[PDB]
Structure 1
Amino acid sequence: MVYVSNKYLTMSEMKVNAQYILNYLSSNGWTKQAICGMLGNMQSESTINPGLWQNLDEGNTSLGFGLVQWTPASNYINWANSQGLPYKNMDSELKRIIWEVNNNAQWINLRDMTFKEYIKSTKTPRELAMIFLASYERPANPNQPERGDQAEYWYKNLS
């Protein structure tokens, strides 16, 4: 059970999705700290909603889409379409992230940590949140300390 929509999720809804992501990536070798660092980012990007378009502007593929706001959305949608996966789908977006780790896509090493180091890291969820912000997301505004607060919140509130 997951929420997939072009709407901002409440805290209760985000928790359902966040637990799902933790369970999924745990089977693929990621630490809870690394996953929660990423979840703290996903909360700011999309309220952890795989269905969400930047500005709620549905169908604008030049702008952000999905958990991590792939921008342009076509960076992800083209991939899903080419891979025969449904683009508006929780697992399809988790598969993209796994593809990125495996193929060294998206990540730029600005903090002396590679994407492969990241997913195995037991640094704090706050620290990993900030590394993921800087290395993977890279939004126009870099000053979003709330992402580390959110990372720590998920680490404490999920199993």
Structure 2
Amino acid sequence: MVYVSNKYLTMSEMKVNAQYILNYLSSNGWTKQAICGMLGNMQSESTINPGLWQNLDEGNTSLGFGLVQWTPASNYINWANSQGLPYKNMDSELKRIIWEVNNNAQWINLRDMTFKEYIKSTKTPRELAMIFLASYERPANPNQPERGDQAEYWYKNLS
């Protein structure tokens, strides 16, 4: 059970999606801290919503889409289409992230941590959130300390 829409999610809806992601990536070898650092980012990017378009601008593939706001959306959507996966889908977006770790895509090592180090890290959710922000997301505004608060929130409130 997950929410997938082009709409901002409430805290209760986010928590449903966030527990789902935690469970999924735990089975694929990620630490709870690394997952929660990324969740802190996904909350700012998309309110942890796999259906979310940047500005709620549905169908604009030049802009951000999905949990981490792949920008241009086509970066992700072309890959899903090419792989035979439905693009507007929680698991499809999670499979993209695993694909990126495996193929060293998306990540630029700006904090002396590789993507493979990151998913195995037991540093704080706050620290990992800031690393993930700087290395993976890289938005125009680098100053979003909220992502670290949010990572700590999920680490505390999820199982």
TM-score class, shorter: over 0.9
TM-score, scaled relative to structure 1: 1.00
How far apart are 1:21 and its partner, in Å?
0.0
Aligned residues: 159
Give, in whole Å, the separation in 2 of the partners of 1:152 and 1:20.
Answer: 17
Give, in whole Å, the separation in 1 of the partners of 2:77 and 2:128.
Answer: 27
Deviations 1:47-106 (A, max 9, x none): 000000000000000000000000000000000000000000000000000000000000
Per the alignment, residue 156 of structure 1 pairs with 156
How far apart are 1:142 and its partner, in Å?
0.0
How far apart are 1:24 and its partner, in Å?
0.0
How far apart are 1:39 and its partner, in Å?
0.0
Superposed CA RMSD: 0.1
Give, in whole Å, the separation in 1 of the partners of 2:4 and 2:40.
Answer: 18
Gaps spanning 5+ residues in structure 2: where? none
Secondary structure (helix, strand or coil) at the match of 2:105 reads: coil
How far apart are 1:38 and its partner, in Å?
0.1
How far apart are 1:15 and its partner, in Å?
0.1
Gaps spanning 5+ residues in structure 1: where? none
Task: Give the % identical residues.
Answer: 100
Give, in whole Å, the separation in 2 of the partners of 1:82 and 1:104.
Answer: 19
Give, in whole Å, the separation in 1 of the partners of 2:80 and 2:117.
Answer: 26
Give, in whole Å, the separation in 1 of the partners of 2:115 and 2:17.
Answer: 23
Per the alignment, residue 72 of structure 1 pairs with 72
Give, in whole Å, the separation in 2 of the partners of 1:53 and 1:131.
Answer: 24
Say whether residues 1:127 and 2:96 are aligned partners: no
Secondary structure (helix, strand or coil) at the match of 1:139 reads: coil
- How do residues 30-41 of structure 1 correspond to structure 2 at under 5 angstroms? 30-41=30-41
Give, in whole Å, the separation in 2 of the partners of 1:25 and 1:132.
Answer: 16
